Each structure stands twice: as C-alpha cells, then as structure tokens.
Design a protein around this ligand. Structure first.
Ligand SMILES: Nc1ncnc2c1ncn2[C@@H]1O[C@H](COP(=O)(O)OP(=O)(O)O)[C@@H](O)[C@H]1O
Ligand SMILES: [Zn+2]
Ligand SMILES: [Zn+2]
Ligand SMILES: [Zn+2]
Lengths: 101, 481, 635
C-alpha cells in the first residue's frame, strides 16, 4: 500500500496490511506533524487476487453421528479459481490463525 | 530465614506438598493400596512388590507420551499425602500444577539417577500434565451448588455437540518496528503483559510494539455441551446442560453421543454484558475445566476356520432367537461377507429384501445385523424419505447412510413407504453404486458401495401363495429386479 | 435537590425491639429462647436457613400487651418494607451471634484465614513503633414466613391483583410455575487481590450488573502510590444459589376475556430448586422492582419492571390397613371399575381394561412392561370424559390431542432453544391419553412407533440430537372416518389405521351406539341424574372413594409377581387355541405380540389380587377378555 499525507503531500509506500487495513502514523517530512487523515493511492499500490474457499472433511473419514467440521482456506495469486466446490481436493500450504478484525 | 511459599489463604506449604507427593510417587507400591482397599484376601503379590508408578513413568518416556493417569484413592492409601487428598477436594488448580511439575522433576531425577544415557532436551521439551480421576463420589448436575466453586468434581453425562478447536494463546510474540527485536511474553489469565518499549537499551523506542499473530504459540480449547444421563434424572424435567472445557491432549477425546464420566474443576466466570464495556453481569457462567476424561490374535479366527461345522454355527449365532428361516440368516450372513471390490467396476455385495408380516419377527433380525456388523446403519422407511437417505444440503453437506456405510449394511425398515424421489435415488444406489447430486453450486459424486437389507410390508392382510406375491408389494419392479 | 420529610416510624426503637425479641421470645404453646437455639445451630453449622415467622412476632407483641407495655407494631413495619428489615434482622443476628459449641473445622474456611491475616495486617500497621462487609461473613440465608389464622400477606392474591402499590411489601401469590431456569450462582461480595501490596478489597453487589475495580484502594498501596492491578478471586467471593422462574395466573382467577399475566420469581440461598414447573404453589415474597443500568434505564425512563424475591413457598398438594379393609370389603375388581368415572353407566369389561392400564405389567431385564389400550368406538359414547377421568385418577398423566409430540422450542430465556418437554415427555412412567387417533399428524404417525418400541423421544433440531425419556403406557381414542359401524365395512378400512400400528398394539375395544330401549333408559336417567343434585350423584351401590385408588395401584406396582410353569403350559395351550381361531369379517389374528399382551393382562390381575402366583382361572378370564375383544371386532 501507498499513502499520501493530506497536509504536505508526502508519500509513504510499502505499507503492509497483515489482517486489517492500516494507515501510516508518522509523516516522513520532519517539518510536517501529521498523524491521521492519510489518503490512499489506488494506482500506485499493488494488489493481489484473493479467494476464500470453505472446506469440510470427506464422507469416508466422518465418524458415526457427527456434523462435519469446517475450515476456511485462502487462495492467493495464481491459485485463485483452481478449486471448484464439491470436489475431493488436496491443499498444501500454511495453517494460519486470523484475529477478529 | 528462607522465604517459603504458601497456597493463597490456605496455610499449606509448597515444599511439604512437593516432597510428600514426590516421596509418595517414589514409594507407593500397590500392596499398600491392596491393604487399604480391603483386597488383602485377593492379593497377587508378584504384581505388588514392584513400584506401581515408577514402572509407569519408565513406560511413558519410552512410549513418548507425557500424560500420567492417576487415581486419587492412593492418596488415601499412602499416609504422607492423606491430607493432600483433601487438597484435591479443596484447592485443585494449585496442587494439580504441583503434581505435574513433580512428575516432570521425577522424569529428570529418573534420568539422572540411574545414569541412563538419555538426552535431557527430549525430557525437558515435552510438557507433562497430571490427569487425576476417581477422586470421590459422582455428583449430580442438579445437586451442584455455589459451594463447589473452585473444587474438583466428577460428572456423568452424554455429549450433545462438539465445537471445532478454539485457539488459546500460551506465549505472546512481540516485535519492535524500528529495530526488529523479537521477544516473547507470558499470557496470564487472559491479559497480555505488553511491554511499553523494547528490552533492548539501544533503541528503547516507546510505543513501537507490534503483535505478530501467526508466530505466537497456541494451545487447544474445546467446549462440550454435557447433558445429564437419563438414568438419574427426575421425572419432571428435561436433562440440563453444562459447559465442559477440555484442553490440549483431551481435545477431541470425547466423541458425539457417547456416555462419559468426566473429571474436572467446577469454575464460574463473569460474563461480559457489553462487547466494548467492562460492565459484568451478576449471573455467572459455570463450566467444568477438565483434567481427565473416562469413557463409559487371529488364532481364534483360525480355529473356527478349520472346522467343517462353522456354517450352522454362524447361522445360529446371527439370530439365536429365530429358529426357522435358516436360508434367510445364511443369506444375511453371505451379505456380511460379500464379494470383493473389483475394478479395471462391478458390485460384489448381495442385496436382500424380506417380504413378510410385521408381526413376524423381522425388525429383530434388522437390529441383530445392525449390532453384528462393524459398519452399518439401521433406518426407518417412514422416518426418512425424499432425499434424506442420500446427501442433502443443510445449514455444509450432511450426507445420509448410503455413503457413510462404505462396504457395510444399510438396514431399511418399513421399505414400502419410499417416495418416488427416493426410488429414483435408490436406482443409482443399486446400479451405479454411486450417488450424485448438484445443488447450490455443489456437484458431488459420492461412492455408495453399500450393501442394502430391506424389509417390506404387504398391504393389510397376509397374502395367499396361489397368486404371486410380488404384485402385492408396493415397490416398483425395477427395485425387485 | 433531595428534600427531607419526617415519617412516624423509628428504626432505632424497632431495632431495639428486634434485638429484645430475639433474646426474649420462647414458644411454649407446643409442649430458653428458640431463636437463640436456632442461631446456636447456625454457629454450629447445623442449618443454613433461618425462618422468621410473623405469627411469632404477632404473638410476641400480644404477650407484650399482656404485660401491659406497647410495641411499635413491628409486624406492620415488616409488611410495609421487608427489604430493609431483612438487613436489619441480619445485623440483629450478627450482633447476637452465639459462640460455637463444637469443632470449627478451620481448614475448610478460607475466609477465616483471610480475615485472620487482615487482622494481623491491621495490628501490624497500627502498631506504630468496617474492615469487612457483613454479607461476607454471613453463612445463613434469612427468610420470612407470613402470619396466618389470626393481614395483607395472609390474604392470597392472584397475579392480576398485584398492583404497583404492592412494591416493597411482603405479598402472597397463587400460581402455576411455567418455566424454571437452571440453578446459577449470583455474587454478593467480589474479592480483589493486589499483586503489589498483597492486600484485598471487597465490593458488594446489589444490582443485576456491577463494574470491576481496576486499581487497589489500599492505604499501603496508595501511600507509595504504586499502580498495582487488582485481580478478581472467585475463591474468596461470596456466592448465592439464584434461580429465576416464571409464575402464571390461574385460569379461575383470570376474568372473562383476558389473557393471564406472568410474574418473575427470584429465589436465593437454600430456597433454590424447590420450585418445579407445572406446580400450583403459594409464594410469599418481597415484591421488589428490577431497575436497569445505563442506556436501557435512560431510554425506558421511569417505566420499570418488577420481580418477586421469594421468602416462603407452600405446595398446594396405615396404608396397608386400608388395603386390608379394601380386601375385606370384597370384589375389588368391580368396585374399582364402577368407582372410576361415576358419570358413565355400564361397560364393565372395558372399564376393567382402563383400570388395568393404570395397573400395568411387569418388565424383564429389554422387554417393555407397558399395557396399551384403545377405544375404537362410535362418536358420542363419552370418549373424552373417560380420557379426562383416567387422567385425574392416575397422577403423572396429561390429556393430549393429536391435532401430541415433543419438540425443543426457541425464544427461551437464553437465545438457544430449550428442551421443552412435550406431552410424551411429561407422561413418562405414567399414562398418555391421545384423543382423535384418526385425526393426527404424519410426524406423530412416525413418532408413535418409537414411543411404543424403544420408549424414547429422539429429536434432532438445530444441530442438537437428543433422546428424551418416555416410558409411557398409551391410551388411544379413535373414532372411524364414518360414524356408523356396518358389516359391509371392514374394520381396518373403517378405522383407516395402518396395519403396523395395530400389529404393535395389544387391545382394541369397540363399543357401539346401538339403540336399546331399556339400555337407553338406564343410561338416560343416570345422565340426567348427575344434573339433578349438586356435584356427583348417589351411586346406588358401593360409593366412590377418589383418594383411595392412588396408593392401592402404587402397591400393585410395588409387588411385581412371578408366575409358575404349569400356568405357562396352559398359556401355551390357550395361545395354540387362539392361533386355531386365527385360522377361522375381522381379519385380526393372534400374534406373539398379542401373547405378550395376554401375559401383561395376566400379571396385571396378579398385581390387583396382591398375589404371588398367577391363577389358572385368572388366565382363562383374561382369555375371556380376549374373546370380548373378538366380540368387539365383530361388534
Ligand atoms: N354416561 C354417558 N354415556 C354416554 N355419553 C355421555 C355420557 N355422559 C355424557 N355423555 C356425552 O358424551 C359426549 C362426549 O363426546 P366424545 O365421546 O368426546 O365425542 P367423540 O367420540 O366424537 O370424541 C359428551 O358431549 C356428553 O354429552
Ligand atoms: Zn505531512
Ligand atoms: Zn526496538
Ligand atoms: Zn495495592
């Protein structure tokens, strides 16, 4: 992400958003003392594809009288739209934990 | 002169407790328990001279597990921990930590005492937890009172539902934004001991702290809605439900619908009235923090494999109550054995339809084949119809017994009450041995591979053998073929 | 801002009256002060419930009037404002607390050790080289009992008669408790510990909500002004067993054209769990309002709810010598048949079957021991009167209509669905009487097989699958689709019932509305003879005794007789005879399930004669009743 200061039009770029949309705090211009009110640069910022597919365990491994447990799986970059719903499929990657945004 | 430690408000020493349990677990042999359980007249001394717990702790370091099942009645047995038994009935959360630290110290002392060549890293890496059971009389859910707050109880019940695994932090991982110092802090009672600055003196920048969520270390927490068992309920009210919180290794130890005797401390936490406010309601949420969960060769095959009389033996073993219809039980028996799954695919299972009167015993046979089989589901034709027996979209995809019983028997009672959609589903159940649906954007092709046993009902009276019986049966001839 | 007024009630003189009444009063009318003995039992941990009786206070002030002095009308001051007087009586008890006379068991009490360390703190800090709230040390729960037979608390009131002027006063209500919640702990004193100074603080709770303390307010903690964080401890906190239930106005108290209102009853302490759903009770309690906190109190304004803090709860509801008196009376079968439901005439065998429904059969370690009976009769022959009557003799039974089933419903006190028991749940170990068995739902048409076969209610709703307990004997009432009974109509075709239901089921009784002149007269003067005089008529026979059956049938359930082998051989021969009759229009044949039913009838009459063996003539009269059922199948 890239942002511009609303006071002196200074540019802060490569802001990384882990799980929530974040804005820079300290203006890099030492003359300016801005802390809030940063405007996003849509063109300059770099974006990636996102897909959230929801999976459950297969009927072979479901035990007697249990509702199937669910899991959210994030596909980013080239792997978007690779998995269609209702297919037996294997995802290899990272187990992550997400906070309440 | 030595600043000793006391359990809060109890006047109970740490050092006395942690030496009493240590000398107990070194020096408890089972013959003293045999004295104090009044089983002196049935002693087997060769199992009693050896150390009862030192052998178990030597087995735990070899098997690789780090959980010790312990019964508290031995604390009544050995004298020095006798008052410690009352601690288990009074102050559980402290003394349980004292036992598990004593267990880890006993692994350390057992490795360094006999000079066994074992690495200390594998001993000290694993977390040892004590799992006490059989501490006292079983308590009722109705008889639970607020005098049991911060006490250790037993409960008997059944699992209604099981939540998915809940993450709980164990060490919070923090990073400085101006110097990349990665440090770790301890979570205590749900509040993070957040530093105001780095531990490094070089930057010491205030307010630079950030929480890295995925690099924190976690542990498991699962909440189980325990329901009172129907044998001990009063006749006037429904069985009540309680929250039952398992942690770490005990998560997913409890399945759904099983009867369990669970051991844990009874705690009450304040529920928060507003999400962003500190105001707590006067009513308190009660939950049982669980420390233990208690449930509820091939030569024997070869010796009946060599007999020539195994046919009538297994034919009377399946249904001893019903004397006649030995062809029926041998047909059901050959359905339990079945063909092999062939691929290059043809189904190997045989299919049996019982046409008979409801007063003639057939649902007893269906109950017996349900109990005999390893995999198999008994269901009722009047109970489930339409697309209930196959996969149906609910809430996820909750699928029926035709795919959940792979290679097993699906026993359908009152088979005459199948709807037309269910006949159409069953047509590809028998022929294609595979169900397939396309609903809500979900296409699924699920392998059925199931052996079906159906029992049908003729309409009204019993039917004469002069005119053929198949036209009386309401089922379509594509199913009969 | 807060102007002051004067009231003609002195709290200091009333407190002196209470603390003199506690040490003065003694009850010698029954044949040392008894309340001092009760407080001694509190100090010896014998009892946890202290009940102050207002009749004792009225007799005490009457005794003061006999001495010549005058009291300050203490019982009227209790009845006007009992909430402040509860704490006043608690402080009067704490001022007159007796010394313990037995072993203290000091290791169990943590609060004694905490207060010992705090007194050590107080003597050490003030050496110079209230400390605790009174509700923390209270181990007794105080209750009030209203005066009777001596006055507003004495008079029982309906829920609708309770008005806004009755807030703050000790009232008495009559009502049926609809919903009883689970026993939940409610706090009264919260203990916080300071991690730096090592001190404590106690915060009292007298509201539905409370806020926690963040920083310690200790003298040592604030003298050096370290900012120690307070930690809540549930170990030293003071708790109480709180339960909220809903009481409903009785339908006789409801005026014509109105809907009954519900009131909240909160029980605390040792009075918890005595309240039961579906129980008509008298509740004497302090009628207090329930205020909100924060935004709800700001938006709703002066409009405030109310509740009831219950103080006393009253239930509205040799035997062997009476059993022997019934034996020496003679003809227990005919007397117990004709005594049950005295508004009908005749029909003796089906009435004996209605008795034997309540008697029941024996179980085996499993085979069900329940008898089930149906009235497969014409309309207008008093079905629902028999169903209501057979509900009224046998307890733990409910009248139900098939227009039935058990289901957990939403909109409970919690957001989740509560497992509210249906008609089959509350009729367990008892009788369920299902009317209009022809006019009933398909879901119930599934459910009756699991009721008769496995005796459970298996409900899977909202991701919750449970099996509720229904060990229930079934009475059925089924009119046919056409009212008239004809030989041109088949029985199974006329009743339109499925064959599997009757295959499971034992005994159908078909009584018909056949016009006979003498029979219509003998029914007609009886039917109008209940209309001549007040309530029940004269029975022109051995009279009814409605209280007497409910213990005799309990004893009949208590014996559980076991029968011999030659009688079993006769049963085998009779079963062979009925299969030969099944070879011989009603299609309904003898089944092994009907043989089990015949067995159930056999030990039912073994239960009634209090006998250890089943008699042979008893067996042939049971098969005669089977022949009566066959005659019912014909007509
Ligand atoms: N002793 C009696 N014998 C026959 N019928 C009676 C007697 N006493 C009252 N009844 C009538 O029986 C009726 C009960 O009807 P009910 O049998 O419930 O109808 P249905 O069979 O259609 O449900 C009452 O309305 C009452 O008038
Ligand atoms: Zn700027
Ligand atoms: Zn830093
Ligand atoms: Zn402090």
């Amino acid at each position: 992400a890239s942002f511009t200061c609303d006071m002196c039009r200074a540019i802060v770029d490569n802001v990384e958003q882990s799980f929530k949309y974040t804005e820079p705090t300290f203006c890099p211009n030492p003359s300016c003392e801005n802390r809030a009110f940063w405007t996003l640069n849509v063109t300059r910022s770099r974006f990636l594809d996102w897909q959230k597919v929801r999976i459950q365990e297969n009927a072979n491994e479901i035990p007697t009288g249990s509702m199937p447990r669910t899991l959210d799986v994030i596909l980013r970059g080239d792997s978007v739209e690779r998995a269609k719903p209702g297919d037996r499929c294997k995802f290899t990657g990272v187990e992550i934990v997400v906070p309440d945004v | 002169s030595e600043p000793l430690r006391i359990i809060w408000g109890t006047n109970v020493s740490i050092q006395e407790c942690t030496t009493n349990f240590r000398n107990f677990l070194m020096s408890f042999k089972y013959k003293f328990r045999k004295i104090l359980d009044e089983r002196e007249e049935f002693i087997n001394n060769t199992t009693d001279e050896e150390l009862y717990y030192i052998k178990q702790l030597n087995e735990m370091r070899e098997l690789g597990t780090s959980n010790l099942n312990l019964d508290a009645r031995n604390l009544l047995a050995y004298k020095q921990t006798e008052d410690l038994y009352h601690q288990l009935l009074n102050y559980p959360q402290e003394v349980i930590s004292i036992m598990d630290q004593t267990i880890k110290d006993c692994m350390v002392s057992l490795i360094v005492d006999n000079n066994l060549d074992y690495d200390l890293d594998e001993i000290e890496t694993k977390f040892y937890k004590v799992r006490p059971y059989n501490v006292g009389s079983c308590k009722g859910m109705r008889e639970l009172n607020p005098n049991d707050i911060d006490k250790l109880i037993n409960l008997k019940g059944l699992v209604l539902r099981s939540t998915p695994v809940i993450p709980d932090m164990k060490v919070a991982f923090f990073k400085c934004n101006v110097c990349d110092h990665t440090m770790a802090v301890e979570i205590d009672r749900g509040v993070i001991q957040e530093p105001a600055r780095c531990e490094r003196i070089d930057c010491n920048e205030p307010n630079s702290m950030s929480l890295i969520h995925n690099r924190c270390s976690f542990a498991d927490k699962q909440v189980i809605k325990l329901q009172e068992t129907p044998d001990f309920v009063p006749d006037g009210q429904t069985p009540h439900s309680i929250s039952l919180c398992v942690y770490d290794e005990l998560v997913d130890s409890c399945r759904a619908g099983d009867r369990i005797e669970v051991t844990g401390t009874f705690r009450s936490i304040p529920i928060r009235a507003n999400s962003r406010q500190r105001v707590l309601k006067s009513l308190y949420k009660t939950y049982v923090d669980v420390v233990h969960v208690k449930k509820v060769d091939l030569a024997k095959i070869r010796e009946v494999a060599a007999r020539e009389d195994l046919y009538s033996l297994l034919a009377r073993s399946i249904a001893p109550s019903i004397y006649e219809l030995e062809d029926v039980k041998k047909g059901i028996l050959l359905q339990l054995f079945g063909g092999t799954n062939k691929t290059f695919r043809y189904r190997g299972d045989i299919n049996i339809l019982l046409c008979g009167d409801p007063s003639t015993s057939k649902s007893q046979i269906l109950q017996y084949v349900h109990k005999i089989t390893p995999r198999g589901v008994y269901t009722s034709g009047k109970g489930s119809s339409a697309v209930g027996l196959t996969a149906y979209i609910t809430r996820v995809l909750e699928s029926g017994a035709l795919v959940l019983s792979d290679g097993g028997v699906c026993c359908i009672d009152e088979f005459d009450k199948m709807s037309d959609s269910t006949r159409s589903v069953l047509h590809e159940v028998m022929e294609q041995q595979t169900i397939s649906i396309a609903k809500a954007g979900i296409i699924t092709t699920l392998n059925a591979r199931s052996s079906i046993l159906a029992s049908a009902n003729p309409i009204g009276s019993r039917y004469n053998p002069n005119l053929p019986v198949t036209e009386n049966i309401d089922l379509p001839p594509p199913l009969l073929s | 801002a807060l102007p002051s007024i004067q009231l003609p009630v002195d709290y200091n003189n009333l407190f002196n009256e209470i603390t003199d009444f506690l040490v003065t009063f003694k009850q010698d009318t029954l044949s040392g002060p008894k309340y001092m003995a009760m407080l001694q039992k509190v100090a010896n941990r014998e009892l946890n419930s202290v009940i102050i009786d207002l009749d004792d206070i009225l007799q005490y002030q009457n005794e003061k009037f006999l001495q010549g002095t005058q009291a300050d009308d203490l019982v009227s001051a209790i009845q006007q404002n009992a909430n402040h007087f509860t704490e006043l009586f608690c402080r009067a008890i704490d001022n007159n607390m007796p010394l313990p006379t037995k072993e203290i068991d000091y290791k169990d009490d943590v609060l004694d050790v905490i207060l010992n360390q705090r007194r050590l703190r107080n003597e050490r800090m003030l050496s110079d080289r209230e400390l605790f709230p009174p509700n923390l040390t209270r181990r007794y729960f105080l209750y009030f009992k209203p005066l009777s037979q001596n006055a507003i608390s004495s008079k029982p009131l309906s829920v609708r008669q309770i008005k806004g002027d009755f807030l703050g006063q000790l009232i008495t209500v009559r009502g049926i408790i609809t919903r009883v919640s689970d026993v939940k702990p409610a706090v009264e004193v919260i203990a916080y510990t300071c991690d730096q100074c090592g001190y404590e603080v106690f915060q009292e709770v007298n509201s539905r909500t409370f806020t926690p303390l963040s920083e310690c307010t200790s003298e040592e903690c604030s003298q050096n002004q370290t900012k120690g964080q307070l930690f809540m401890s549930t170990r030293a906190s003071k708790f109480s067993a709180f339960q909220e239930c809903k009481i409903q106005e009785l339908s006789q108290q409801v005026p014509v054209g109105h809907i009954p209102r519900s009131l909240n009853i909160h029980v605390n302490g040792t009075l918890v769990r005595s309240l039961s759903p579906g129980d008509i009770v008298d509740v004497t309690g302090i009628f207090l309002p329930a205020p909100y906190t924060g935004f709800k109190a700001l938006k709703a304004g002066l409009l405030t709810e109310t509740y009831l803090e219950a103080q006393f709860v009253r239930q509205h509801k040799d035997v062997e010598e009476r059993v022997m008196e019934l034996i020496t009376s003679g003809d227990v079968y005919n007397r117990l048949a004709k005594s049950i439901a005295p508004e009908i005439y005749g029909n003796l065998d089906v009435k004996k079957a209605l008795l034997l429904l309540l008697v029941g059969g024996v179980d085996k370690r499993k085979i069900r021991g329940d008898i089930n009976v149906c009235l497969m009769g014409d309309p207008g022959v008093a079905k629902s009167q028999l169903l209501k009557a057979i509900c009224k003799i046998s307890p733990r039974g409910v009248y139900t209509t098939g227009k039935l089933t058990a289901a957990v419903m939403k909109d409970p006190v919690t957001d989740e669905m509560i497992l509210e028991g249906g008609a089959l749940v509350l009729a367990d170990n008892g009788i369920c009487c299902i009317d209009e068995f022809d006019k009933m739902d398909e879901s119930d048409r599934t459910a009756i097989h699991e009721v008769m076969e496995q005796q459970t209610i298996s409900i899977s709703k909202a991701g919750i699958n449970t099996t509720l307990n229904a060990r229930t004997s079934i009475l059925a009432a089924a009119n046919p689709l056409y009212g008239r009974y004809n030989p041109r109509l088949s029985p199974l075709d006329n009743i339109n019932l499925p064959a599997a239901l009757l295959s499971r089921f034992d005994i159908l009784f078909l009584m018909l509305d056949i016009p006979s002149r003498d029979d219509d007269e003998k029914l007609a003067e009886h039917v109008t003879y209940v209309h001549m005089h007040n309530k029940q008529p004269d029975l022109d026979f051995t009279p009814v005794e409605p209280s007497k059956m409910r213990e005799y049938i309990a004893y009949a359930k208590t014996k559980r007789p076991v029968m011999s082998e030659a009688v079993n051989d006769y049963v085998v021969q009779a079963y062979i005879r009925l299969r030969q009759d099944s070879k011989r229009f009603s299609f309904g044949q003898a089944t092994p399930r009907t043989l089990l039913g015949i067995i159930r009838l056999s030990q039912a009459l073994a239960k009634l004669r209090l006998a250890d063996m089943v008699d042979i003539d008893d067996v042939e009269e049971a098969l005669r009743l089977v022949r009566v059922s066959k005659e019912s199948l014909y007509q």
